[PDB]
C-alpha cells in the first residue's frame, strides 16, 4: 500500500487551494491512505481529502477550526507503526533532537509532522522522519521562500519509498528516498 | 360519415377508367365526356377537407396522363383548333374552366408565342371565382400547372413569344390576392359556431397559400431590385389592406423564412415599418424572435462579407422594434424582456467590442423598469424569472467581470430585484468572479464592488431582518479571501489606500462577521511590510511606512478586540511582533515592546482554560524564545514578568511540565547585550531545573512521578551533551540511583513498560555512563 | 311448628296451677297426679331438644317449689313411711322414679343414717332409664339434688350421716359411664342424614356433660392425692377408651379448665401418656394450647413453688409432643409451627435461664424443615406467617440480639422464604433488630450483620424487578445510622478495618444504593481521625495511621466520583480537606491541595446551571478562606486561581457580587511569614474593589446597580474603620454623592426607601451622627 | 403567641434523630409557630415538624435535598417582623457585622440564622439576633464540641422572651433572655 502525506494547506487563511498542477496529480483510486499533518483549516478541505481516499487520518493543527481532531495519533500501516502530530507542540519548532525525543515516547518507526512548511525526509538512529511541507506553499513568517509540496510513500513490506513532490518553477520536480526498518 | 368518400372514389375510378379507356382508343370527345362526368363527382362537397383533398389529388394525377397525351399530340402536330369554343358547350362553368386551364397550358407549351395572351386571359377570367372550396382547389391546380412554364429572364425571347418576368410576377400576385380573399372569406361563411372548425380548416389550407410564395421564390428573375420595387409593395398593400391577423402572420413568417437576407437587408425599413402597423391581437413577439434568430444565424454565418458597416442593424432594428412596441398596446412586460434577451444575444454576438451599445441596451431596459412601478420582484413572478435570464447573459457572456465595472449602468439593475433573488444572483455572479479569475481592480471599481459586498453582508429579506435560519453561513468568506489575495498585486502606495477602503468596509461588516474577514487583511499588511523592507533602497520613508502600517494594524486588532474575542488578537500581536522584529527598523524595539504588552494584557485578562493556558503559554514562549531585539533593560522586565506569570499556574502536573519548559527560556534567552548570544550562566539554568525538581518531589504520583523523572532526565542529557559544564555526571548518577530504587515498586501497566523501553533506549545510546 | 310447644306450655301452666292449688290445700297426691299429666306431655317426639329443654326448665323450676314444700312438711314431723310402694302406683315409669329421687333426698335430710344407702340406691335405681333426653334431664335433677348433699371435706362428720367421698367418686364415675353410653347411642340413632343435626344437638347437650365435672370441682374432697391415684386413673380409662373425638375433646377442655395446677403438676405425665393414645380425628393443638396457657399462667405466677428443677417439664412435653406428632398422620406444618410458637413463649417465660433449650428447639425445627423437602413458601402460605410469628418471639422478647446472632440456624430458616417474602420479612425483622438500638459489634458479628444486609438489600432480583416504588424509597437510613452508631465504641484501628469491610460489602450491594451509604462512612473516617488525635500522647505512628485512613477515604471518594455525582462529593471534599488541615500531619498541605484541585476539576467539567454556578463558587470561596496552614508562597497562588475562575463566569450581576466578595480573600488572608499575622495586602484589596467598581458602573440596571453600590459602600466603610489607610473618606464622599445624584433618577420602589434608611443608618453608625 | 426555632438537624447525614430528652419536651398543642433555619435534610424531618404545629416556615440550608425551600424568608409574628436564612450565605460564616449588614436589607426586628451550630442570642443596635444551634448537636468541622439545642420564644406584644434549650450532660439546662422593640 501507498499513503499520501500532506498538510499546512491553510485554506482559506493564506491560500485558496492547492496549486493547479498538483490537483492534476491527486486523483481518486490510487491512494489507499492519507495522513494529514497540517491545519487545512476549513472542513471544505477535509471533504476534498475524503475524495482522494476513504481512510483519512488528521491531527489538529494550531489553526484548525474543528477542535475535534487529535493532538497526535498513531496509525499502523502494514509493518510500519507511524506517528502523526502537527509540530507546533515540538519546541524548538523544527528541532531534530526534539522530534527524536518525541519518537521515543510514541514508539513509532516513522514520524510525520509539519508546521515548518519545509519538506524534510531523513533517517536518525534507525528511525524515519518526514515533513511533507505545505501542499499550498502557504505563507510562513520564518521562511520567506516556501515551496508547495506533498509526499506519498509506498510501503511494500518493511521497506518504504517516499516520493517528495515539489513545485519549483512551473514543472513539478520529484525526488526519491528509501527507508527500510532496521 | 366518411362513406361518401369511398363511394365517391369508386365512381371516380369508374369514370376516369372509362375516360383513359377512351383516350387510348383515340376517340377524344368520348373521353372528355367521361372526364366531365367524373369531374361531376367533384360537385359533391360534403366531403371532409382531407377527403375532398384526396379526391382532388387523385383526379389531378389522372389528368396528368391527359396532359402528357395532349402535350405529345401537340408536339405531334395533331392539333384541333377552337377547342375553347367547342368545350364551352359543356353547360356548367366548371367543365369550361377545367378545360380552359388544361388546353391553355398545352397551347402555351405548343405555342410559347401565345403565352402572354393565354396567361392574361386566364388571369382575367378567373375573377369569376367566388366559391371558397372549388376556387381554392382550382387555383391550386393553376399553381401546379404554372410550376415552370411562366416567363423568365434567361429564357429564349422569340418576339412571337410574349411575356416576361414582370408578367409572371403580376400573374402570381393577382391570383394570390384573389385566393387570399376567398380564403379569408372562409372565416365568415356558414354559421358563426363553426369558427374553430373553420379556422382549423383554413390552418390546414395555409400551405396552399404559402405555395404561391414558394412559386414566387423559384422565379429566377427575382433580383433584389424587383424584390424592392414590386414584390413587397404588392404584398404589403394587401397586408395593410386586409387588417386580419392569422393570415398576415402566417404569410409573413413564411416570407421571413423564405427569402434571402440579402433582399431583406435592402428592404428592412419598409418591411419593419409594415410590421409596426400590424394588428394588436398579433403575437409580434414570436415573429420578432424568429427574425432575431434568423439574423443571428446570418451574423455568424460565415462564407459571407459579414455585416456591411453602412448597415447599422442595431440602430435600425432598435428604432423599429421600439416603434412596434408603441404600436403595441397590451405587451406583457415579460414579453418585452424575452425580446430584450434576444437583443442582448444579437448585440453580444455581432459586436462584443462596442460597450456603448450594451449600455444603450441597459438604459432602455432600465427606463422600462422604472416606468413599471414594480416592487422588488419576488420569487413567484415570471418577471423576475425573465430579468434573471436577461441579466445572467451579460454575466455569463462577459467572462471578465472587470469589464462589468466599465458598465456603470449595470449597478442600477440591482435595485429592481428582490433581496432573495439579489442574494441568489449575487452568489451566482461572485461565484463567476472567482471561477473566472478576474483579478486586482481599479480603485473606483474596487469601490463599487465593495458597495456590492456591503449590500450582500448588509441586507436581509428584502430589508435587513434577522429571521434566523439554521443553515450554512460560511459561503461568504472564501470569496473575500480571494478578493483580498488579488488585491495585493498593486504597487506599494496603492495598498495603503486600498487597505483603508477595505478597512472601512469591514468596519461596516458587523460583529458576527469580522473575525474571519480581517485575518487575511493582517497577512496582507505583513507581506506589504515585507515589501517595504525588501525595497529599503528606492524608498526612504519605508521605515515610516512600516511604523504607520503597524499602528494601523494595532487599531484594526483593537477592533477585533472590542468584539470581545481573545485568541485571534493574541496571535495577531505575535505575528505583528515577529514582523517588526525581522524588520528591525528605528523605534522597532519600542513598537515591539508595545505590541508585547498588549499581548500580555490579553494573556492575563483573557485567560480561560487549563488547556487554553498551556496553549497560550506555549505560544508565548515559542514567540518569545527567538525574539532577539530587546536589550537587557527591556528583555529583563518581560523576562521576570514571564517567569512569575508562568510560576503561577493551576495544575501540578502541568505545573511541572511548564516549569521544565522554562529552562529553554534561560538557555535560548539571548538579548542584544553580548551581541545576541546567551551569557551562558549555568547557574540560572540550574536554579530553573531546581524548582522543577522541587515540584517533582511534591507531585507524589507513582505513575506521573516516574514519567516525569524520565522526561527531566532526558532533558538533563540534552544539556550535559549540550556542554552545560554545570550538569555534573554525579548529579545524574545520584538521581538515576533514586530512580532505580523506585522503578521496581510498580504494578503492571501499559505505560510502565513503555517507560522502561524509553529508559533502556536512553541508556543504550549515550555510552558515557 | 312451634305450636306444639305453645299448647304444651299452656297446659303446663294449667297443670302448675293445679300444683299450687293442691299445695295450698295439702293435696299432694292430687298434685302428683297432675305431675304425671305433665309428663304425659313429654311423650311427644316432635319438639326440639331446645324446646324440650325450655319446657323441662319450666317444669323443673316449678317442681322445686313442690320439693321444698314436701321437704318442709317432712321437716314438720309429718313423716309417712311406705312411700316406695305408693310411688310405684304411677303408670308411667318417669313419675315413679322422679318421686323416688324427690322423696329419697327428703329421707336423707330427715334420716342421715340412710344417706349412704339412699345414694347408692338412687345411683343404682337409675338403671330404669334408657332414653337419652329424659335420662339427661333426670340426671340433671340428680346433679342439682346431689349438688350439696354429696359427701365432701366440708361436711359435718355426724355419726348419723352416712356416705363418704369414695361414694361420691363411685357415683360420678358411674354417672359418667352411663351418660356417655346413652349419649353415644344418640350418635347412631335416627338416620345418617342428620349428621349436622346430631352434632349440633350434641353440642347443645355438651353442657349437661360438663356440669358433672363442675360438680366434681366444687368437691373439697377432690384432693390431689385421690386425683393422682384413683380419680384421674379412673377417669382416664373411660375417657381414653371412648375412642371418640368430639367427646374426648370437650371433656378434655373441661379438664383443662377444671383441675387446679396442684392436680396437674402431680399428674401431668400419667395424664400425658393417656393423652398420647387418643383418637386420631381430634384437634389436639387446641388441647395442648389450653394446657400451655394454664402452665404458662403458672410459670409467671408468683407466690407459688414454680416448677421443681428435677422435673424438666419442657423436655418432657417436647418429647411427648414429638411422639404425638409422630403418631399424627398428616398434620399441617403450619399447625406444628403454631405449636412451636407456644413452646418458644413458654421456654422463654418459664425457663429464661436456659437459652440452650431454645437452641435445641430451633435446631429441631430445622431438622423438621429439612425433612420436609418443600419449595419456597408462597406469599399466601400460612406457614410463612407462622414462621414469622415464631421468629418474632425471640425478636420481640429477647432484647439481646447478639444471642440471636449466635443462632446459626436463624439465617438458614430464611431459605424457605420466597424472594418477595424474603424481602418483606427480612425487612420487617431487620427493622425490628434496629428499633432496639444496638451497641458495639464485633468483627464477626459485623460479618453476620453484613450477611443479613446482603440478604435484605440485594441478590439478583427473582424477576427483573419492577418497582412502582423500589422500596419505601429510602427506608434504609436507620440501618446505616446504627452501623455508624455501634462503630464509635470499638477500639480504633480495628474500626478502620471494619470500615474497609463495610466498604467492600456495600460496594457489592448494588448500583443505586451506595450513593447514600458511603457519606456516613466518610463521617466515620473523620471521627476515627479524631480518636487518633485523642491518642496523640502515647502514639507517634498516628501520622502513618492518618496517612492510611485518608488514603482509604481518597479511593472510596473517587469511587463515588465514578458514580457521577458532583455537589455532594464537593462538600465531602471540603470536609476531608478541613480534616487534614486540622490534623496538621506531615504532607497535610499536599493533601489539602488535592482536595481542592479535584473539587475545582469537578466544578469545571461538571458545570451546567447558572444557579449551580453561583452556589458552587460561593461555597468554594466561603470554604477556602479558613484554610490557613498554607505558606504565603502557596496560599497566594491558589487565591488568584480562584479569583480568576470567578472572573470568567457569564452573568454580570453575580460577577460583580462575587468579585466584591473576594476582597476578604485579599485582606483576611494571613501569611506564614508573619508568624500567624495577616498579610495585610490592602493595596491588592483596593485594586480588587477598583475592578469591582468599574464592573459596577456598568450595571445600568437601577435597582440592582444601586443596591450593589450599597454593598460596595459597606465594604469601604468596613475597611476604612478597619485601619486600612488606602480607604479614603474622600472616595466615600464621592460615592455617596454619586449615588445621591442618581438615586432620584429612579422610579419609587419598596427598595429605594430602604436604601435611604440604609444610607442614613450607615452614616449614623460612624458615631459621626 | 410562642414560636419554635430550630435547625441544622442534619438527619440522616450526621444524626438519626433529636436527643431523647428533647423529644419529650416538644409535643403538639403548645406551639403555634415554627421557624426552621437549618437543613433538616430529609422530608422525614419536615413531617415530624409538621406535627408539633401547623404553620411551619423553612428556609433552604446548604444540604437540604428539596430545592423548593426559600433561600431566605420574612415572616411577621404579631408586632414582630422576623427574618430567616440558613447562614452559609453570610460571609464570614458567623460574623456579627455581616449578619447586621443583612438585617438592614431585610428590615427585620429579629433575625434567625444557624449554620454555625452554636447557640447565640444577643442584641445589636436595637435589633435582635438568634441562632438556635443544632437540635441534634450535629457534627461541624469548625467546632469539636457541639451542644444540642433549640429555642422557643414567647411574644406577648412588642416584647419577646426567648428560651434557649441546651443539652449539657444528662439534664437539660435552660436560660432566659428578654428583648423588647426599641
Residue numbers in the entry:
A (entry chain D), D (entry chain B): 1 to 182
B (entry chain C), C (entry chain A): 12 to 780
Q: Could you give the paper's own sentences about this structure?
A:
Retromer is a master regulator of cargo retrieval from endosomes, which is critical for many cellular processes including signaling, immunity, neuroprotection, and virus infection. The core of retromer is a trimer comprising vacuolar protein sorting (VPS) proteins VPS35, VPS26, and VPS29. Here, we elucidate the structural basis of membrane tubulation and coupled cargo recognition by metazoan and fungal retromer coats assembled with the non–Bin1/Amphiphysin/Rvs (BAR) sorting nexin SNX3 using cryo–electron tomography. The retromer core retains its arched, scaffolding structure but changes its mode of membrane recruitment when assembled with different SNX adaptors, allowing cargo recognition at subunit interfaces.
Using local reconstruction and three-dimensional (3D) classification, we found that, for both metazoan and fungal retromer:SNX3 datasets, the arch is asymmetrical. One VPS35 monomer is more curved than the other, and the two monomers interact via an asymmetric VPS35:VPS35 dimerization interface. This asymmetry causes the arches to tilt by approximately 22° away from the perpendicular relative to the membrane. Arches are assembled into linear chains via two homodimerization interfaces—the asymmetrical VPS35 dimer interface and the symmetrical VPS26 dimer interface. Asymmetric VPS35 dimerization has possible implications for retromer function. It leads to an asymmetric VPS35 surface at the apex of the arch to which cofactors could bind directionally and with a stoichiometry of 1 cofactor:2 VPS35 molecules. For example, a D620N mutation that is associated with familial autosomal dominant and sporadic PD causes loss of affinity to the family with sequence similarity 21 (FAM21) protein, the retromer-binding subunit of Wiskott-Aldrich syndrome protein and SCAR homolog complex (WASH). D620 is part of the buried interface in straighter VPS35, where mutation may disrupt the coat. D620 is, however, exposed in the more curved VPS35, where it may contribute to a single FAM21-binding site at the apex. The interfaces of the two VPS29 subunits at the apex of the arch may also be differently accessible for binding by regulator factors such as the Tre-2/Bub2/Cdc16 domain family member 5 (TBC1d5), Vps9-ankyrin-repeat protein (VARP), and RidL, the effector of pathogenic bacteria Legionella pneumophila.
